[PDB]
Amino acid sequence: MTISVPQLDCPLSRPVHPEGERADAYAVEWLRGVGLMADEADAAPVLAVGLGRLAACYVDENASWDTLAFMTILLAWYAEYDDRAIDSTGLTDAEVAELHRALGEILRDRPAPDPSDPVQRGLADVWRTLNGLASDWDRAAFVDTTLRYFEANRYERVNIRRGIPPTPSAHIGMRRHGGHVYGMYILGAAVNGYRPERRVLDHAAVRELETLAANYTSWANDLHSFAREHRMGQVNNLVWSVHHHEGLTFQQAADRVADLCDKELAAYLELRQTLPELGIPLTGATGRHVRFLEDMMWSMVDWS
Amino acid sequence: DMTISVPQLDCPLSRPVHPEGERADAYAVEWLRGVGLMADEADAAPVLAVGLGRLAACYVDENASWDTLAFMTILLAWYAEYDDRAIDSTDGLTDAEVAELHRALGEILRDRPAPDPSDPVQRGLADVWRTLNGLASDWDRAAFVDTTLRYFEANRYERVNIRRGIPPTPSAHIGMRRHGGHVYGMYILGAAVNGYRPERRVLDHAAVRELETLAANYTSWANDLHSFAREHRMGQVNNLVWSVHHHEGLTFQQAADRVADLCDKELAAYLELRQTLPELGIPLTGATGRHVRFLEDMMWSMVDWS
Ligand SMILES: [Mg+2]
Ligand SMILES: [Mg+2]
Ligand SMILES: [Mg+2]
Ligand SMILES: [Mg+2]
Ligand SMILES: [Mg+2]
Ligand SMILES: [Mg+2]
Hints:
The structure is a homodimer.
Chain A: H1 20-34, H2 44-47, H3 51-58, H4 65-85, H5 93-107, H6 118-133, H7 139-162, H8 168-178, H9 181-191, H10 198-201, H11 204-231, H12 238-245, H13 250-274, H14 285-303
Helix pairs in contact in A: 1-3, 1-4, 3-4, 3-14, 4-6, 5-6, 5-7, 7-8, 7-9, 11-13, 11-14, 12-13
The complex binds magnesium ion (MG) (6 copies).
The site of one magnesium ion (MG) has 4 residues of chain A, from α11.
PDB class: lyase
Keywords: Diterpene Synthase, Pseudopterosins, ggdp, Hydropyrene Synthase, lyase
Assembly: dimeric
């Protein structure tokens, strides 16, 4: 709490979509039309989140307000679920298991089993808008990443109830599923109108480059949100874990996390440069996919 | 060169060896001469000292058939010849020859005959494939073929790095090394051979996935830690000691010490996840229990066998 989070210099630049602030208000609008917030709740603490500006970081400049609005809706729904169902506990394990079962039922195009639960309406709306804006994409892969995201959330809840942070290694492993970064990649492909060949996405080099990018993004998020997650007792934070198991001050832990981020950025750049020599050019959809991976890296730094 | 001191690795995982081990050793040589990977009157003492049959004994049950132990020895011997000729040497092979090797070996995995039955590696993989299909009934052949394709791609990556003469980033190497050793294929083959197959609803669970990654990391880093000298002489820069010394500014001794400490930390993490698994809804009872036990088998096998 009484520590100073270092900066992260990453050589990735990107322009923001101009309608960002709009989506902010729209976020609140949607957030009030679904049930995550109700009517006479101050929107200034919610506009300060900047849900629309992050969505602007995730879509092209030449994108529709429909697309930017959908990205804002999805990022707003993720924020409410992660805050309500994971970090507070609180909710019982039976309630969260039912939430997971029912949300996984929505992804199978079936109606929300409890349309009075606000999260059910929210995910149903996100799913219908996503199916309206997408043409050809691997829905099965996204549903699988969502199942693993739910399992990682259950893991996060186990650790939070234990009151202890996981091992740094075990946390790095489970954090890739805990943030749904692969689902983010799949949705960025489906939304922005590009889909790489599965003959490339399954390539080992592309696989490990995706893992490196997800590591950088999620560790940057942890480094920035350490204070907020530490106050709430959310021990699923790499700073928590490094301080706990490696015997470091919270300041030393944050510094080591920043250095690990720098090293992982170097690793990502090395792999990316090696990709063309392996027979994978960053030309067509693969190029846009790598550029979207890079988007989320810079987005975390500049947005946080 | 100078002198390096490989630290020891204490892991609280114990396992008995299959008794027919030494037998398999000789059998390995026999098979290596019956396929073309070994020629006529070549001294078997440098090959028996490898202990390909003893590792196979570490990978199968005590109460297992000589058919099973023999297939395990054949497979571990074929991996050793392929990995040494097609990866670490480049004498050497051209990139086109290795690309043809990969295409043809992946063609064997599609149940087609070896395109070049005079190439010893082709006969070897053909024999391994027919023996594997003879000893297995219902298993994920597709998953193993996918792991073999990624293994071949990681081999191409290893060759790119060796040709560059430079080791990759530690992180980039840890990421690729899991494919460079075919450890997931090893898990799949251990399931298929020893007569157990976990539910895909469990193997796809995130906890099981990351526990598999932890086990593979431990195994591969231990392998790197022990084979650093052999891979350093051969210019094989796909070694975690190489990479840590190169990019983190450490002595080779400091790099080996750092790799050993990372191995210790990853063992701790593996134990933490394994203990957490039942709370997540995954008991270590049926085939999942035997799967976790096989993961532990390879972690101990690396330490004790090397
Ligand atoms: Mg969370
Ligand atoms: Mg949170
Ligand atoms: Mg966070
Ligand atoms: Mg090799
Ligand atoms: Mg080798
Ligand atoms: Mg080695």
